[PDB]
């Protein structure tokens, strides 16, 4: 409506194709493989949105935490509605074990994200762990992520970066996330029917 593409999916509190949009990604960082998705992103004659993992699934981590000046909603810091930025709990970030089997006979649109920081003392602030990662897999694809850390500019007022990724989780299949830190999990997902 007022938004771009991606952020509108991620949910981007600033919006509820578009040529060159005001709001794409409210927090900085890359977007991995925008182009590819765009193509078969259209050719969809049917659409609705539903949840998969609520924030209430995690007792071992601090759920509603990340919201920033870079992503406010009416002057109040917020975050991409559907993505969820996870912070350490009780000075502790237990490695995440979570999996979602798609029981729906209809396919599923899946995305998640990785937060890049600058100082590792600052890494120690949020995630408590000096060296973290993300590793996900579905059937064909197996992903492994690590945050790149030195220092940076101020883009969107922010010194940090956030890369997000995408996949398509086949029906009666699963997807396996693994991270001890620097990870941004999903909350709500998209049921998709192709053309």
């Amino acid at each position: 409506r007022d938004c771009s593409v991606a952020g509108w999916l991620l949910g981007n509190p600033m919006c509820d194709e578009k040529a060159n949009p005001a709001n794409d990604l409210c927090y900085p960082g890359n977007f991995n493989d925008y182009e590819e998705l765009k193509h078969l992103l259209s050719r969809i004659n049917h659409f609705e949105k539903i949840q998969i993992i609520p924030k209430s699934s995690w007792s071992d981590h601090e759920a509603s935490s990340g919201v920033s000046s870079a992503c406010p909603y009416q002057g109040t810091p917020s975050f991409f509605r559907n993505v969820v930025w996870l912070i350490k709990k009780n000075n502790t970030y237990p490695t995440i074990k979570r999996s979602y089997n798609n029981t729906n006979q209809e396919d599923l649109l899946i995305l998640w994200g990785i937060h890049h920081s600058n100082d590792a003392a600052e890494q120690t602030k949020l995630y408590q762990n000096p060296t973290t990662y993300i590793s996900v897999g579905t059937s064909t694809l197996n992903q492994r992520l690590v945050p790149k850390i030195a220092t940076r500019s101020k883009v969107n007022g922010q010194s940090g970066r956030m890369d997000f990724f995408w996949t398509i989780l086949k029906p009666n299949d699963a997807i396996n996330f693994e991270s001890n830190g620097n990870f941004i999990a999903p909350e709500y997902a998209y049921k998709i029917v192709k053309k």
Partner: antibody, heavy 123, light 106 residues
Framework: EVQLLESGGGLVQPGGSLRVSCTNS????????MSWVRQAPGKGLEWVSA????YYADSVKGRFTISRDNSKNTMYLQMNSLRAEDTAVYYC????????????????????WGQGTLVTVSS | SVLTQPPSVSGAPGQRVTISCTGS?????????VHWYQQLPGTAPKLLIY???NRPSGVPDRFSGSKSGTSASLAITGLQAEDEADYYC?????????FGGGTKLG
């Protein structure tokens, strides 16, 4: 050390005026939001105001003014109209946020606290 | 500036004491975090807890915040004579900032 320093406070009369600077070293002023928190005698803490963009608590509104100079790396609080109940020790404070390079007060905390400078309203 | 806190606790060394900070559904029924401050008697406040469960450095592991609904709790295990102070909780409501009323302490 990381030093927050508030200077120049003392006796002011009711309906007086006071300008209190907070003096800063050890980090990059412009990279953080700052606040003032005051504590009355035998009382707890009450948010006064903050600046990255200026915010103020209700009790002070219109008679307090928060101002920051990163050129000189200090920040003021202008208090006019001062009554009685305004007497408190004044802590200059650091706003520290999960979300980092934010200049934002919305939800962040106070990690670094000033030494405090007591303002007194009476004769 | 007031959330709610008990006036004072009392405890014994090594024992465990629990500090409640209550509130309405407006502020802690919102999801904004709770932060705590340990302020030595005649000294500035020191940031104690932040983000409800986390501590900065120079702070012991004997300190744990737990946030529940419209309330929140500060607990201390393995007590020491160095731990005596006024404990306030901070949170936001419709901006501003709100504080506890503090809690004091064989």
């Amino acid at each position: 050390e990381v030093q927050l320093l508030e200077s120049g406070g003392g006796l002011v009369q009711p309906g007086g005026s006071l300008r209190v600077s907070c003096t800063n070293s050890g980090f990059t002023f412009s990279n953080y939001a700052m606040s003032w928190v005051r504590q009355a005698p035998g009382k707890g803490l009450e948010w006064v105001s903050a600046i990255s963009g200026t915010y103020y608590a209700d009790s002070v509104k219109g008679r307090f003014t928060i101002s920051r100079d990163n050129s000189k790396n200090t920040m003021y609080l202008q208090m006019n109209s001062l009554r009685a109940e305004d007497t408190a020790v004044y802590y200059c404070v650091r706003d520290d946020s999960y979300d980092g390079g934010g200049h934002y007060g919305l939800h962040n905390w106070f990690d670094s606290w000033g030494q405090g400078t007591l303002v007194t309203v009476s004769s | 500036s007031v959330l709610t806190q008990p006036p004072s606790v009392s405890g014994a060394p090594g024992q465990r004491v629990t500090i409640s900070c209550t509130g309405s559904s407006s502020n802690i029924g919102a999801g904004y975090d709770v932060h705590w401050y340990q302020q030595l008697p005649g000294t500035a406040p020191k940031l104690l807890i932040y983000g409800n469960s986390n501590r900065p450095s120079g702070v012991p592991d004997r300190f744990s915040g737990s946030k529940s609904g419209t309330s929140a709790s500060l607990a201390i295990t393995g007590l020491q004579a160095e731990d005596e102070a006024d404990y306030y909780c901070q949170s936001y409501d419709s901006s501003v900032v709100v504080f506890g009323g503090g809690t004091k302490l064989g």
